[PDB]
RNA sequence: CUGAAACUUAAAGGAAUUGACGGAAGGGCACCACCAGGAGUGGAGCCUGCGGCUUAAUUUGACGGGGAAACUCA
């Protein structure tokens, strides 16, 4: 797994050697000893051997010798570490870790900055390990496309939070002091939030984005004040989104409307007095 | 025979990092300048 | 290091024989007293 | 572009005759400094290496081959400095005798002389307590062309076959410290006296680089002109030697200090000191205006954690809402449960053996320090920083300190010394008003009260040494340091030690370190001198722009030679960017052992010491880094993790740094 | 067409022999894989194990016969 406490055991030369490993591993399949000795551009063999041994005993570089072919292999934790070093070069990550929520393909920790403000993170471990290149490359491109999705959702006035960076497949997000409806019990002004939550579906479908897994576990509700009870609705449906040009959007849309009416008729016992938003008006809206 | 000029801290990487403690020397008889290795000193405290 | 000026010839381990007696000592080291070590001829043996 | 060259035979002989034409031209122009009719000055210093020799006997034996009785008849009565002209080789000589009761006087004799002549005894062996250190100290202060010679070879048995074995013994001794020459010559032989007289007349002496790049005058006549009742004008009549003298640059006098010039007068033009004078101040007032932009005024009182926030934690906020509940008699736990709201020779030997105990423990445990349970490390370690790597962290020179000397702000800061010294030698060869080899009348602004300390110029020397631009101005400079042989006596980094670099001597308490090159120019402060290799010694001292060698001593008047010569070195650099920091090590024993976490014993004695020191990394003398885990016990017991698995024979160390600055300088007299 | 030199460099090259690697291909052959289902988990409360938080200690590894107020207790 990922144990982030071990990369501060490394010096400047150690992640210089790790940068040489990630530079040499993207040109060939397996990088041997002299390409790490030459691509790094550093003085001695001894320092390269010491840095490679430092990554080896921290289980970051796997030594492999398949019949007179010495070579080295990057694991998940080493590329997590070098992505967090090039995140440190962009002077924003400072102190990391409380595991809140373990997804299939993205695990959520709890981080901070130099300013000390509360933030979180999204790692991406595709396959969990028979490491090749397709798994980590596909995690990297998935993190990149959800970063452009994340910035496009934040840039258009939605109640979707602020992105910062897409440092390889390591995605650093703002913490939101928000509660799910598993924790939430009763609210004063339920029809106003129901109006906001059909209007969110309306302007997503006007934008052309169809969030499909729109269950009770999706909605994160921020409590800004305790005396006036200000609210904000955070929606996490990023890999399950589908475009408006797809052929199967109809039962997705009525499934979203049917789930929100059944969840608001189950817990809060509130019924929709206006009619349901159907697919064709939103189709002409985009 | 020569007269020394400078201190050359050349770094020379692969395969052995030689921390080169060597002296630029101006010769006497012809007036051109060659580099020159100083042997066996760990400190080069002798050829000032 | 620096010799005292009384080096005028006119007016610790035991020392090691030189010249012909050293050739005597090498002969009796190698062939008079042959050290049979592991089927071979080991010069300078350690603790073994 | 240009075609190939086919050099002919005639072009080759034109090449050879042109190179030898210009080369005989500048060899002659180097040899026309020594026109022995009027414009010549050769300096001979004859020093004998045993107590039982008289140097006037060596003078007698040398000049009996020149066949002039009347010069000696003048020279017997009461004279010590002589100006002998010879008609045998047509050269002008000036011969300097030393006073044997002062070592520094012999240093002053041979540091000005173009020839150093070493007298030797064929009867008594030379002293390993007097004459060896004469040889080594003159050797390390710089010698030109030298002559080695004997005078007691008649006092041994009169058969010459015994005498050549003595001559070979002197040759083997003199080869050990002077390998440029191989023959010890005899004054008892008349032809050998002719040979050594010929070599002292004709041969070009080699140039000592530091003294010939500032210009120096030896003085034959001293006179005084009264100008004010508190200060007047010295008159110096001598011959200028070196690069020359300018009326604006300052001039150093040995055993007197630095003085400022009034006017000059050549008799073989008259020049004066204009408005471009170098002021007689030790700190330049323009250096106050140089350090105008302070950057780091970081306070240490308002710090919850140590100064590791560039490489460690976040500042932790602890809003202490202390409310008191009063039932009569209550511990902290119940009060925490009630009001929670959520929104003199004896002294010398005494200091000798305590300091020798300090470097023997410093050799065994390098820089550790012990903590008692009674003493708390909170007020002890305010000013320390616990940076993980010394050679990667970002310090700065500009940071302030309440332990600052106030004259650090008024310091002369040179960016590149390499361009600066080449620049200062090129203008001090350019606008030299008087070139060398001229009889000069030199006038010195000089206070009246120091006139008792001068001597007769024909009984004692009067060496006059010029100094360069801003040489009187102080800076932080550096010196190399190598200890002398058979010297095992300790030196720490805070005792008064007088440095002889150049002709000035200055008492200093020098910082000791190792010259390992750093990317951020930080170095390890060592408490004592390293006994093995060449250490480095930086301090606050006046600057020297010729890379003169430095000899290090303290005056010890217990011996007849009233000097304890410590070591030697060379002026390396005048850099303010080179900074020093000590390392503090706090020892600790790993108590209990486990696959992941290690309990450490006897490190601190409080839990909040661990809480403050939660950021700083741990390292092992076996070569393993580590980090702390949780403050376990109330007696400073804490848990810690490591890179691997350690045994009971390893020790946990902890590095803390605080910045150390150099100490100022003062000149030494006597 | 004729045709260098300074300088730099311990290999450059020819034939031939094996094959880790394949995300080339083709077979098997599996409910720790799928289809046909069934029971479910993940949704609710509670017990336990790990992590986290706190502690003076939450001893502690990756089920440790590690069931549990003294003991086991480290």
Curated annotation (Swiss-Prot), chain B:
The modification 3,4-dihydroxyproline is found at residue 15. Hydroxylation at Pro-15 affects translation termination efficiency. The stereochemistry of the 3,4-dihydroxyproline has not yet been determined. There is a cross-link at residue 7 (Glycyl lysine isopeptide (Lys-Gly) (interchain with G-Cter in ubiquitin)). Belongs to the universal ribosomal protein uS12 family. Component of the ribosome, a large ribonucleoprotein complex responsible for the synthesis of proteins in the cell. The small ribosomal subunit (SSU) binds messenger RNAs (mRNAs) and translates the encoded message by selecting cognate aminoacyl-transfer RNA (tRNA) molecules. The large subunit (LSU) contains the ribosomal catalytic site termed the peptidyl transferase center (PTC), which catalyzes the formation of peptide bonds, thereby polymerizing the amino acids delivered by tRNAs into a polypeptide chain. Present with 10600 molecules/cell in log phase SD medium. There are 2 genes for uS12 in yeast. This is Small ribosomal subunit protein uS12A. It comes from Saccharomyces cerevisiae (strain ATCC 204508 / S288c) (Baker's yeast).
UniProtKB/Swiss-Prot annotation, chain C:
Residues 1-22 are annotated as: Disordered. The keyword DNA-binding does not apply. GO terms for molecular function: structural constituent of ribosome. One of its GO terms (biological process) is cytoplasmic translation. It is found in: Cytoplasm. One of its GO terms (cellular component) is cytosolic small ribosomal subunit. Coiled coil: none annotated. Its main location: cytoplasm. Pfam families: Ribosomal_S30 (PF04758). The modification Phosphothreonine is found at residue 35. Keywords: Cytoplasm, Phosphoprotein, Ribonucleoprotein, Ribosomal protein. Present with 37600 molecules/cell in log phase SD medium. Component of the small ribosomal subunit (SSU). Mature yeast ribosomes consist of a small (40S) and a large (60S) subunit. The 40S small subunit contains 1 molecule of ribosomal RNA (18S rRNA) and 33 different proteins (encoded by 57 genes). The large 60S subunit contains 3 rRNA molecules (25S, 5.8S and 5S rRNA) and 46 different proteins (encoded by 81 genes). Belongs to the eukaryotic ribosomal protein eS30 family. Component of the ribosome, a large ribonucleoprotein complex responsible for the synthesis of proteins in the cell. The small ribosomal subunit (SSU) binds messenger RNAs (mRNAs) and translates the encoded message by selecting cognate aminoacyl-transfer RNA (tRNA) molecules. The large subunit (LSU) contains the ribosomal catalytic site termed the peptidyl transferase center (PTC), which catalyzes the formation of peptide bonds, thereby polymerizing the amino acids delivered by tRNAs into a polypeptide chain. This is Small ribosomal subunit protein eS30A. It comes from Saccharomyces cerevisiae (strain ATCC 204508 / S288c). The lineage of its organism: Eukaryota, Fungi, Dikarya, Ascomycota, Saccharomycotina.
